[model samples]
Target: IHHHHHHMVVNLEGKISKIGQNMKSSIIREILKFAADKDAISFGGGVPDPETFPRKELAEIAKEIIEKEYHYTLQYSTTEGDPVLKQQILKLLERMYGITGLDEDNLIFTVGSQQALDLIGKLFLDDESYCVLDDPAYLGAINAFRQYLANFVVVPLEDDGMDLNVLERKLSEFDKNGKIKQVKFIYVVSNFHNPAGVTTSLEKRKALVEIAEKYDLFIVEDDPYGALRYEGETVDPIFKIGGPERVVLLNTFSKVLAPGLRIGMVAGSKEFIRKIVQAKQSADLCSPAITHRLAARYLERYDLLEQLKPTIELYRRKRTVMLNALEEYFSDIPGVKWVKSEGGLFIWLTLPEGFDTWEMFEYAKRKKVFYVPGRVFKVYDEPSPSMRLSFCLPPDEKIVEGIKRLREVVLEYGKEKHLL
Candidate 1:
C-alpha cells in the first residue's frame, strides 16, 4: 500500500546545539526528585521547611488579589515588573540593607533568581566569554552560564572568602592566554554561600571590588540567603559596599519568603537593568502578576521581619541539632572534617584526600540517607573530597538521624580505604 511506502526517520542528535548536546542536569535536583526514598532522612535539597511558609497570610492575601484586584493581578505586568512591588522591594532594600537611591529604573523582576542568572548570561555571554567564579560555585550558575558556552576561571574559596592571590593568579593566567578581553564578571554568593556555607568577609568584599575595578570586570552578587542569618554578627552585603555601578545584586524571596511564588528582583545601573528588561521580555512577558501583587500587598500589609524571626529560630534549632549530631558521630572519623556554618542551611564536609563523595553516594543511598555530592557544583566537574548537607529541609530529629546514618556510611568507606 502507498501508505506503507514512506517512513519518516528523524536523527535528533544532529539537530542539537553544542550546548544542548552537552547540557548537564542539576545533580542535586535530580537526586532530590528520583534518588531519595520518601521515608529516608534527606539532606539533599536546599529548601526551607514547609512549616516556615507563611501560608495563612499568603492564602488571605492571594484571595484578595485574585478576587478584588483581578484586572491588574490577572493581566500581564510590565516586563520590568510591578511598580508597587518594585517600590516595596526598594523600601525593603533601604530598610533591611540600607541600599537607598534605587528607583524603579534600577530594578528588573524575575521569576526567580535562577532566571536572573540566565538573563545575566544572555546580556553578557557569548562564545569564549569567561566568568570567574568561586571554586565549587552554585551549581545552578554553572548550568546557566555553560548554556552560553562560557569559560570558567575559578579560584579557591577559603573560610573567609575567595583567595585574592589565587583569583589574581588565575586572572593573570587567563590574560596571558589572551582571554582577558573575554572575561565578563565575577560571580559570588558573598553571603552564606551554598554548598560551602561560608560568608565572605567585609575586607574581602572590598578587595573584590578593587579587583573588579582593576580588571574592568563586573561582579554579580547572588544574595538569596542574605536575610536568613540565624547566628553570628551581621555582615553587610557586598552590594552595599560595591554599589550599583560595580555590581549587579540578585536577590530572591525564595529563602526568606515562599519559593513557590517564584518572585525575585535584580538591582543594577539603570542601563544594565534596562538591558535585563529587554532580555526578560523575550523570556516570560513578566513574572506572574498575581504573585507579584500578592507579594507586594503582603509586604505593605504585614510585618515580614516579625514573621521571619520564628522561621530563622526554627532553622537555627535544626542546624544546632545537625551540628551536635555530627560532632557526636562524625567528628571522630579519621581524616574527616567539616566547617561550621554560622548561618545558612548547609554544612560542607571534606573527606580524606583521594576520597570521592560520588563513590560514597551509593553507600549513603543504601543506608537511606541522601546528600548532595560536592563535585557537581564545580564548573569543571572536577572531583571534590566533599559533600553538602542541608539542615533546614528535614525535621530536627530527621537531621540528627540522617547524620547518624551518614556517619555509619563514612566509617564503612573509611575502613575500606584503611583510613579508619
Candidate 2:
C-alpha cells in the first residue's frame, strides 16, 4: 500500500479509429433515461406494449428448448443462422406477406434487425458510396450507416411514404453528375414508418421498384411493422415486387412477437446473403442459437398471425385512445398537427415553424411527459419542429394524461415565445 504506483496515461482519443470518433451518443437514448422516471409517462421509445407479449408461451418454449435441445440450443450456430429457422421465416414471408421463390440460402439471422442494419452497412457502405434514405429516417439505420462514413441522399417523406418524384430527380441528378455508380441503394422502412407513422402506398411501392431498376440500385426494405396492420390494405413489400436480386428485406420479431428474443432475418439473393454472412461472421459470429430455436419451435407449433391477433387488437385500441386524446387535448391549437397512423407504434406531431421540440423537451420532462424530438430522426443535421409520440406503451388513461401534460407544455412554450 505504501509503494508508489507509476501511472500510464493512455491517449484514448488518439488511439480511437475514425469510425469510433465519428460516433455520437444517440439523443433518443439520452432522453430515454429521463423517461425512466417512475412518475413520468413516455412516448419516446418505440417499445411494444408489454401486455401484448405472449410471455407464458415463450417461457414454455424456452424451457423445453433448453431442456431437450440443449446441445443445439446452447451451442454456437452457423453465421448464416439455423436452416429450420430460415425455412420457417421463408414460409412466413410467403404465407403472410406474399414474398415467394426464396430458399434457405437467401436468408441469414442477426441479433436483431438493428444488427441486420449494421451488417448492411458493413457489406455495402463506404466513404464514397451514397445511400438514398427517407428524410426523417429511422435513427438506428441512420446511425448504422453513419458509422461507415456513408454519404446520404435523403428524399422527403410524404403521407404515402418517400416522394418518388423527388427520388427520381435525385437519381437523375446523380446520373448526370457521373456519381450514379457510387450510389448504392435506397433504404425505406416501407410499412408504418417508425417516427412518421406513414405507410408507403402500394402504388408507391411499385414505383419504388421501377425507380430502383432504372437507377441500377437495390432497395433495402426494412419492414419490422408490416404484420402490425390494424386497418387498411396490406401493401406488398418492395422485395416481393422487385424480387430478391433487386431488394433486400429486413424483418424482426421485436414488433410482432417479443423484442427480448432478438430474432431478426435478412432476405436477399443467395449471393447477397452470402456476402452478409461473411460480414456477420466478424460481427457476432452468430445470433443466439437458443433464441433462434425457440422462434423456430414457436413458428412450427403455432400460427404466428393467430398469436398476434390479441397484440394487434391491443395496439389498435391504444392507437385509438391516443388519437382521441390528441384530438381532445391539442386539436384547438393552431399549427399543431399529427399524421394518423394506420398500423404503427408512433404518431408524428408537427408544431408550427420556429417551435423546436428539442428546446421544449425539458419543459415536457417537467410536466412528467416524454417524447423523441424529431431532429434526432433526420439524416441531416437540421432543426425540426416535430416530435414522435409512441402510442404503444402507456395505458389508455396514462396516454390521455400524458397528452394533456404535453398539451400544456406546448401551450406554455408557445406563450413564452409569443408564437401562439
Candidate 3:
C-alpha cells in the first residue's frame, strides 16, 4: 500500500537553522570511530582506564538494588536528581575539595557534564551573544555552545593557567564597545584542563573572580579531571576559592568512575540550580536514577580514593612512557614542544609552526596511530601545529609505540619540508 504522493523527496538543505549549520562532529569522537579497530593504536579521546572501574562490586550491587528497589530504581527522577545521591556528592566535595555550603537545592544532575554545558548554553547564549573561555578550551564545551550559535571572546592559556592580563583587557574591550552585555559567563576547566592539561594557579583563580565581578558575569568552572592528581600539592579549586554565589561548578563520575554511568552534575546557588532543573526538565526528564543510586551506594560502600591509587599510578607511568618515547624519537627535531602534564588523561603537543597535524593524519594512520588535531580546540581558527594525545586506556608498550609512530610521521613531514 505504498502511496505515490508520500514518495516526495525532502530538500533539507535550506530548511536547517543557522545554529544547525555551524555544528560539526567532535574531532575526538570522529578520530576514535575512524580508528576503531584491533590494530589501530588510538591516542584520541580522553577516556578513562577501564581497569579502574569496580566491575565485580558494581555487578553485585546492581543486582541487589534492582531486585529490592525495582520500582524506585526503574522510575524517573526529578530533574534536580535523587536526594540521597545529591547529599553524598555534597559531602564528598566538602570533604575532599573544600566546596561547602551546598545542599540538595543547590545541585542538579546532568546526563554528563556535556549535557550541563548544553543547558548552560540554553540558559545564557543566543546567536547575538558571546562567552569567554580559554583559547584552546574543551572541545565538548565548544560543540555544546555551538548548538546555540554562541560567539566567543577567548583568552589564551600559559604554563600556569589562563593569562589573566589578556582576560582583563578582553573584558574591558567588550565593556567599552557595549558588547560586554552580550557576553555571558566565562568558562574554565580550572584544574588539569583538557587539551592543555595545565592547572590554573590560585593567583589566576582569584584574578578570574575579580574579572568576573568586575564584568558582572558568572564563572562556569568545569572540573572533571581535578580529582585524579598523581603528583604535586592540590591547589584549591576555583569554585572553592570563588564560592557558589558566583561560580557554577560542574563535576562528573566519568573520570573517577565509569563513563558508562553517565553521571554528572552542577552545583551552584539554589536559584541557579532551580533554573537548570527547569531547563533539564525538557532535556531528558531526569538522569538515570539506577546509575545515580549505584554511584551513591558505591561511594558509601567503598574507599574509592584508596581504589584509585593504583589507577593513578598506572596513568602516571603511561604518561612517563609516552614522554620518554617522544624524547627518544623527536628530541632531534628542532622546535618539538609538549607539556609534561602532571595529571589528567592528555598530553598536549605543539609541532613547529608550519606542521599541520590534520594533514599529517593520513601518514600517521598508515602507521596505525591516531590523535585529535589542534585546530578543533581553538576558538578562533588558524593553521595550528598542536594536537592532544590520551595515555589512559593504552597499555604501557602501546603508549610508547603510538608516540613512536606519530614521531615517524612528524619526521617524514619535516624531511619532505626540507627542515629535518
Q: Which predicted model would earn the best lDDT?
A: 2
- 286-394 in candidate 2: lDDT tens per residue? 8889999999999999999888888889899999999999889888878888889999799999998989998998799889899999999888768989999998888
lDDT of 3 at 198: 86
Clashes by residue pair, model 3: none
Please give the lDDT score at residue 255 for candidate 3: 95
The parts of candidate 2 lying over 4 Å away from their true place are 1-10
Candidate 1: residue 165 Cα off by (Å): 0.6
How much lDDT does candidate 3 score?
0.85
List where candidate 1 sits over 4 angstroms from the true fold.
1-10, 33-39, 176-178
Q: Number of clashes in every candidate structure?
A: 0, 0, 0
Q: How does model 1 fare in lDDT?
A: 0.86
lDDT of 1 by residue, 277-331 (tens): 8899988878889989999999998777777888888888888898899889876
| TM per candidate | 0.95, 0.96, 0.95
* Least accurate 10 contiguous residues by lDDT in model 3: 4-13
Tens-digit per-residue lDDT, 99-184, candidate 3: 77778898988999989998999899989998988878898898888788888988899878998889888888888898788988
Is candidate 2 or 3 superior in lDDT? 2
After superposing candidate 3 on the true structure, give the runs of residues whose Cα lies further than 4 Å from its correct spot.
Answer: 1-14, 34-38
Q: Report lDDT (CA) for all predictions.
A: 0.86, 0.89, 0.85
By TM-score rank, best first, the candidates go: 2, 1, 3
